[PDB]
């Protein structure tokens, strides 16, 4: 991985810096690194592909060094370098595609493609140089048993789930108390609804709780918490829990009461926010507990008093809500997020070459299924393919 990244980084530097007219002093160290790459790769045969529709490609490396002396780079120098760089970039792209389409349950962190396994030999260690990207840096830090960190803008930490729980219900589904939630990506909208508006609840307060367990610990997390849940605040004909029938929901939104967001780690409270909205910071947590109360307004105006009768039928159902959006966090494990394209790159490469479903990932690299069952083997394979995709992105 370090060697493949070094190859890609050398090629990217050569592309960006070996340009017509530039001072040779701008590239001297780069020229030496490029020549070392050529020396180390010379005389080696590589094979890529042969899985799915990814074609078999053979690579033989017999290239000369760049020894020409100049004050400034000319067109001849650039064209020679460009020929070598093009061949090497094609090879690195094929090695990355070959590694991205493969998985193993055992040792999923270890290289899977034959070319990358060969590149892990000691003789290729000379290619290795500056490892500065977040993904390769995390790879090296992990190999050193040091605490790594991936920063995510809007981490895709919640598998898609649009569910509800009914705590009070009956076959008519006309006097219902419970909660409905959407957990999607980095967003969680939750809404507790009571059809009776807590007319007969003790102290006229109905308590709702929602526990969301994150599959991985998040740290340094910036969260936006908003009182209402716009997703559960319009009339809705929802399906029955078993799907036999349908029930009706006619929200009228009351502000949530006694709002308490608890960010928990191993069941212990790390962060607690009471009646606080806007930006909050959850420093380290694996669980979120949202507790919110529907409090019957003690004093109503006639228009309000008419919406909440003493007994059934209940036409306007009292709904309190909450919205929780993780704008940015840090996770030790790799995750999809809103800004990066590593998951999309891996999925695209697997779909374009018709990679058969393997024993580690779900079909099509579906993120919901993957993150719902984010097992250690899955995590290792995912970090491998994401590092390979980041290496590929540098050139492709």
């Amino acid at each position: 991985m370090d060697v493949l990244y070094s190859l890609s980084k050398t090629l990217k530097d050569a592309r960006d810096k070996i340009v017509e007219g530039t001072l040779y002093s701008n590239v001297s160290d780069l020229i030496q690194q490029f020549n070392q790459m050529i020396i180390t790769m010379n005389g080696n045969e590589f094979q890529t592909g042969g899985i799915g529709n990814l074609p078999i490609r053979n690579w033989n490396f017999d290239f000369g060094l760049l020894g020409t002396t100049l004050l400034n780079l000319d067109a001849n120098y650039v064209e020679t370098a460009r020929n070598t760089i093009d061949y090497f970039v094609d090879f690195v792209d094929n090695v990355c595609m070959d590694e991205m389409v493969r998985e193993s349950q055992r040792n999923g962190i270890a290289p899977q493609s034959d070319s990358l396994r060969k590149l892990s030999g000691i003789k290729f260690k000379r290619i290795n140089f500056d490892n500065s990207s977040e993904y390769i840096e995390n790879w090296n830090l992990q190999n050193r048993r040091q605490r790594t960190g991936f920063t995510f803008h809007k981490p895709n930490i919640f598998p898609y789930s649009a569910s509800f729980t009914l705590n009070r219900s009956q076959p008519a589904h006309d006097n219902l108390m419970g909660t409905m939630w959407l957990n999607a990506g980095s967003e969680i909208q939750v809404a507790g609804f009571d059809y009776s508006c807590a007319i007969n609840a003790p102290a006229n307060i109905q308590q709702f709780e929602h526990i969301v367990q994150l599959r991985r610990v998040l740290t340094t997390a910036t969260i936006t918490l908003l009182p209402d849940a716009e997703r559960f605040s319009f009339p809705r004909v929802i399906n029955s829990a078993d799907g036999a029938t349908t029930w009706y929901f006619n929200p009228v939104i009351l502000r949530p009461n006694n709002v308490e967001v608890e960010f928990l780690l191993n069941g212990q409270i790390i962060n607690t926010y009471q009646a606080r909205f806007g930006t909050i910071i959850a420093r380290n947590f694996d669980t979120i507990r949202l507790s919110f109360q529907l409090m019957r307004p003690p004093n109503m105006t006639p228009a309000v008093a008419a919406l909440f009768p003493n007994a059934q039928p209940f036409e306007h159902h009292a709904t309190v809500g909450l919205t929780l959006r993780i704008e940015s966090a840090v996770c030790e494990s790799v995750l999809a997020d809103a800004s990066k394209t590593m998951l999309a790159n891996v999925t695209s490469v697997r779909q374009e070459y018709a990679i058969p479903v393997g024993p580690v990932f779900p079909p099509g690299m579906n993120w919901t299924d993957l993150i719902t069952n984010y097992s250690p083997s899955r995590e290792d394979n995912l970090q491998r393919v994401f590092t390979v995709a980041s290496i590929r992105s540098m050139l492709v």
Partner: protein
């Protein structure tokens, strides 16, 4: 050393010459292109007037390729020679430039050499067969240095009488060779057709070689004498001699 490359660990018997490996291993266009020309500047074969001739690449005949050589060595004069002690590097680069700065003289010399070769080759009558000979002519590279550093601009071409003499000697040798072949074949075939089974064709072959005038017959190996007998047996008899024999 000029390009800082590791010295070539060349292996005898390699199908590639050192220059053929260098052409692939060198990235500079001046040096690589000059190397490519050197790697492919072998004689071309062409039959003119029924005589096989070994002819040169046209870039040699017009001398244009010397420019490429100049280019390559000018590049070599600009090279750093990374680890080389500087006085030795200066000496090497200045000698390179000594050859480099005679570009006009070297183009003229190449053209003169090629023209003299072509004019004298016009006088050859026997096929110019290319074979790697048992012994060689030893050429000193110091004599090459003398020619390269001392040639002026005075054109010298073969005299017409020199060309006629060269052509006449070539024709006389070729004609004598053919006539002695015919005499040997006629006598061998006559001896066989006359059933002279004690006749030694070896004496006939020795007389033939002696009449060719350029062979010390005592130093002809026996296998080659017998091969010569075998090849002479297979040839048909010339018409006039065969008619006399009939």
């Amino acid at each position: 050393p000029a390009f800082g490359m590791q010295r070539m660990h060349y292996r005898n018997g390699d199908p590639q010459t050192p220059f053929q490996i260098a052409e692939q291993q060198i990235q500079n266009f001046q040096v690589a292109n000059w190397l490519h020309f050197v790697n492919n500047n072998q004689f071309r074969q062409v039959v003119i007037d029924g005589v096989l001739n070994q002819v040169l690449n046209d870039n040699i005949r017009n001398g244009h390729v010397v420019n490429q050589l100049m280019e390559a060595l000018m590049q070599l004069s600009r090279q750093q020679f990374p680890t080389m002690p500087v006085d030795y590097k200066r000496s090497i680069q200045r000698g390179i430039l000594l050859l480099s700065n005679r570009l006009g003289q070297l183009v003229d010399l190449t053209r003169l050499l090629a023209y003299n070769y072509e004019t004298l080759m016009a006088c050859i009558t026997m096929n110019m067969q290319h074979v790697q000979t048992l012994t060689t002519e030893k050429l000193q590279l110091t004599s090459v240095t003398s020619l390269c550093m001392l040639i002026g601009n005075a054109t010298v071409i073969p005299s017409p009488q020199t060309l006629f003499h060269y052509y006449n000697v070539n024709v006389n040798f070729h004609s004598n060779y053919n006539e002695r072949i015919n005499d040997a074949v006629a006598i061998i075939t006559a001896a066989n057709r006359l059933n002279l089974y004690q006749k030694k064709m070896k004496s006939i072959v020795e007389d033939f070689l002696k009449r060719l005038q350029i062979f010390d017959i005592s130093r002809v190996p026996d296998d080659q004498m017998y091969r010569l007998r075998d090849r002479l047996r297979l040839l048909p008899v010339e018409i006039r001699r065969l008619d006399i024999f009939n």
